[model samples]
Target: KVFGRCELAAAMKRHGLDNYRGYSLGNWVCAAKFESNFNTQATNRNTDGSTDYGILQINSRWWCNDGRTPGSRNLCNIPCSALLSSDITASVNCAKKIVSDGNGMNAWVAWRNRCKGTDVQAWIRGCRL
Candidate 1:
């Protein structure tokens, strides 16, 4: 379990979610693994007064502001995250939109440079799409 976070990051990169958060993408993965075992379709479904949905664990209230969309599912079939918030658009547009607060794509780059080696989130430090 030591390398679990790194493992998940590489997995998502292989799956095409390479451009993770911007620095702590690995941390996010760590959280996701704990939140839903890295399952893109994982959902809490109102379990115990707590509510979370989608790969990024985006809450419904977040989507309410931007209108969340369908995201990648287990084999792309079953619905997870209680809210589809991992699609190509969901992360970029609504729900768990990576760049919350309208931060430009390369905002992270302007801040730090640790993303040069690897780590999904760090990659956003200065690179562009």
Candidate 2:
């Protein structure tokens, strides 16, 4: 399922991502815009043989187990397929864990390049919180 900007914002906020770990909802929404274009079924295979899955593009290398990413840490203890579901609970939970694990939103290159150090509040402007 592809989510609209405000729809994604509301979903993430419902899952407690608003101001999570000092990162605002705009930051997360901005990252998702670049990372997966708000598509729940998005996937990208990396040159390193790891695949990133879902809206936040959670990686198979260190996060979810895809059963094909060599030496996968599977830190989230979730199958990568789970991230692809329209129900984004697993994706959000895994993302929260990624931040809690100290990777911060910097774990996502899209976030670092596009969302970091920017006034991302516009991403969620006019979207009722």
Candidate 3:
């Protein structure tokens, strides 16, 4: 029952897109792909010689400045660099919540909706979740 990258991807494929959770995940994947090329362990170095971490790419400085709570968990205070050290789903979900809820403006500008005509199957591709 151990899950690797492919296994986890399969489960993600099975997730439904009926509510905001589903929608957010879809959006997150698109953003993740763009940022990390599907590498969950992805990270980036800032111009100021700072560090970024996690899959969805969360930043540490933002965790303190922005406050990784109910609201600010979705955003990186300094720039587009978000933290990637937390759970993939948690980080993605937090992003989704922030996008879908914050000021009702949606995170589309930041994350955007690139998962067009795609679904769980696209995530896993060939296996069952």
Candidate 4:
């Protein structure tokens, strides 16, 4: 797992996250806080039988396929477990592709609910990125 929020934010910044997906880095950081708390191994099963994976909490329904899930599109062409790695380059790349679908950060319900209109600068307060 990551040391903390700042560490994750800095790493994301170095990975070109300032606005990589047509969104502010603050938006991504704030959404990530509530999504998985920066935990790469985080996974959550939805009532719909789909699951969210990793720091970005990407969905298996459309973004990935865990093999056991039915009707998975595997649009990102990566296994669900790949998103759960400590080296988040894969997760970040997948997240970028997800946003490329024209939905922007709307793919993340967390972003819509919490980070939409908030002053998200606090998410990277001391990140120094």
Q: How do the predictions measure up, each by TM-score?
A: 0.39, 0.96, 0.45, 0.93
Give the count of colliding residue pairs in each prediction.
8, 0, 12, 0
Which prediction has the highest lDDT against the true structure?
A: 2
lDDT of 2 by residue, 1-129 (tens): 999999999999998888889889999999999999999999999998999999999999998988898788998989999999998899999999898877789998999999899989999999986
Ranking by lDDT: 2, 4, 3, 1
Q: Between candidates 2 and 3, which one is better according to TM-score? A: 2
Q: Which candidate should be chosen as best, given TM-score against the real structure?
A: 2
* Candidate 2 residue pairs in backbone clash: none
**Clash total of candidate 3:** 12
User: Is 1 or 2 the stronger prediction by TM-score?
Assistant: 2
The window of 10 residues in a row where model 1 has the poorest summed lDDT is: 71-80
Quote the RMSD, in angstroms, for model 3.
6.9
Tens digits of per-residue lDDT, candidate 4, 1-129, equal 753778888778777777885677788788788899878899999987999999999899989879767877988899999999888887788888888899888888988888888998888887776
Winner of 3 and 4 under lDDT: 4
How many angstroms is residue 12 displaced in model 2 relative to the true structure, after the best TM-score fit?
Answer: 0.3
lDDT of 1 by residue, 14-104 (tens): 5444444443444444445455555556545443333355555544433322223333223222233334434323422332243444652
